[PDB]
Design a protein around this ligand. Structure first.
Ligand SMILES: CC(C)(C)c1ccc(N(Cc2cc(Cl)cs2)C(=O)Cc2cncc3ccccc23)cc1
Ligand SMILES: CC(C)(C)c1ccc(N(Cc2cc(Cl)cs2)C(=O)Cc2cncc3ccccc23)cc1
Lengths: 306, 305
């Protein structure tokens, strides 16, 4: 029993964190094979960040202007290039602790684990969701840039996030490991604002199934709904539209609990209309939307990573 | 900025997890130097669990009745002893991945990271508090027994918890790594229940200071309180007493924010009286009590390992 915000064990990614220094700017990099990945703004001064020309800034740097530390052991940079908003430093040494890995770009609604790092040392690990406005509600302090987000699937680490910036509301923005930003943001110090955020409907349904599996059933009801009628109500409360694909993905949880997806949709419709009436679900007074259907299955069926 | 329930990186503990099998029972063990630690109930049948005599059950075992697996590597057991409710299996090989470590017993209110494991493989990591009733609100399924709780300071892992059992409310009970149970619990399938749980007051105050540090002050008020008047009110909402020791521990956060401890106590009294009125504090509609004052400082000052 029990249901907790659960991160993947961080060990395989701990092996890959390094410190990258360029001038008086120190942040985190990700060392895989003979390449170190980090945000390209590492080459920028505070004054540079206002209107940076990254091509021109990089053209002026040599390999030896970049100090890479792996624990307290110096890696020699033998090459540098830019892919979109990430810097790739080629180093003389392949990382012996390099795990099996892919670079994956995730969809809004999908979750991942963050290894928060400072000076190339891991501080801590937590679970996050890519919001529909392409931001994450993280815990990052000055020096966290180059901290990575990952999912572990079977034997393989899937890196999906690199941290670049904090927005003025205190939410966070970054890229995939190919340097492509999630959301309509740029790596410049300029007025940038998170768009209006919505609730991740398929995840709230997943979390209601988690509640049922943990013996909390007060919200279930005799009513049903069509997909269309559910979406007409849900959109009024700033909930993402629920697709047929969402319904199919919730198939395994529906089968395990014996509650049809559209019956759980009918339960949610009444919760949105009526509220909770001062009751709670899995120790929360709000409807939680940062657990995916896979997250609920993994934690409720005890899948491990080796 | 931002504030999140944060576990310690689990790498140093991942290196130490093994599978222990005895008969039809498989659970997790902790391999440090040439010893494997696991719950002693590994030597029990389902029938054995109501009134086991562990001295009698253990004296009937040989070294080779214990199958220890570290990945694909069979470890040979060359000895076994019992310390309270943990089994210590002596193995032929010292763990090359053994970190610097200590065995510590924590107090109620203190937090730690859990590496949840099945068949000696890590599933997941989360942050926990030892509740005042000496239980933890974990996420553990059959096979999780021998999963460990830890705090990391510098390079040193301090192991404070081993998982033994699930209570009927769905909360969890276990031991320190000397085999002494937290609370009045025993390793028998006899009926035992969690005592009435209370809110960890000093941690709620710590978390209110975190909210201030992250630029949220809507919940503050013009009032103060005496310690005694705070405790008479907070006990009526099932909150732990706040001691002078608790007040002193909140000293650094009080100094950093310029909000006196008893002023924050006054704020908490009104939050319990009024609720949130459809607002949140650090993205929560409830008052969070699983962050210690040290946890708030660590996460707001960016400490690494
Ligand atoms: C390298 C230089 C000059 C040094 C630098 C680099 C990055 C930052 N910023 C601002 C921006 C980054 C992007 Cl990308 C667009 S604005 C940050 O957001 C850094 C940052 C990231 N995460 C959490 C933060 C918390 C506090 C302060 C800054 C934080 C500022 C200076
Ligand atoms: C060895 C044998 C038969 C194999 C065995 C060993 C232990 C268990 N128990 C019951 C107890 C443990 C303790 Cl200590 C007292 S009762 C558990 O509580 C296991 C357990 C732990 N954590 C989560 C659980 C969730 C569901 C079911 C059991 C869970 C049952 C069988």
């Amino acid at each position: 029993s029990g249901f907790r915000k659960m991160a993947f064990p961080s060990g395989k990614v701990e092996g890959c964190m390094v410190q990258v220094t360029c001038g008086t700017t120190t942040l985190n990099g990700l060392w895989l094979d003979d390449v170190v990945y980090c945000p390209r703004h590492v080459i920028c001064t505070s004054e540079d960040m206002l209107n940076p020309n990254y091509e021109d800034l990089l053209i002026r740097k040599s390999n030896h202007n970049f100090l890479v530390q792996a624990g307290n052991v110096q890696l020699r940079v033998i090459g540098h290039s830019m892919q979109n908003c990430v810097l790739k430093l080629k180093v003389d040494t392949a990382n012996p602790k390099t795990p099996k890995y892919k670079f994956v770009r995730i969809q809004p609604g999908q979750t991942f684990s963050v290894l928060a790092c400072y000076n190339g040392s891991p501080s801590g690990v937590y679970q996050c969701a890519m919001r529909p406005n392409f931001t994450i509600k993280g815990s990052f302090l000055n020096g966290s840039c180059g901290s990575v987000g990952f999912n572990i699937d079977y034997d393989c680490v899937s890196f999906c996030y690199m941290h670049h910036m904090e927005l003025p509301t205190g939410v966070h923005a970054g890229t995939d490991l190919e340097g492509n930003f999630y959301g309509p943001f740029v790596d410049r110090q300029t007025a940038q604002a998170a768009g209006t955020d919505t609730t991740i409907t398929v995840n709230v349904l997943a979390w209601l199934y988690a509640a049922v599996i943990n013996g909390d059933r007060w919200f279930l009801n005799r009513f049903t709904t069509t997909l269309n009628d559910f979406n007409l109500v849900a959109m009024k409360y700033n909930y993402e539209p629920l697709t047929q694909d969402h319904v199919d993905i919730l198939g395994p949880l529906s089968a395990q609990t014996g509650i049809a997806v559209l019956d759980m949709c009918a339960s949610l419709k009444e919760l949105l209309q009526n509220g909770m009436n001062g009751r709670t679900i899995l120790g929360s007074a709000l409807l939680e939307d940062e657990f995916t259907p896979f997250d609920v299955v993994r934690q409720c069926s005890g899948v491990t990573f080796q």
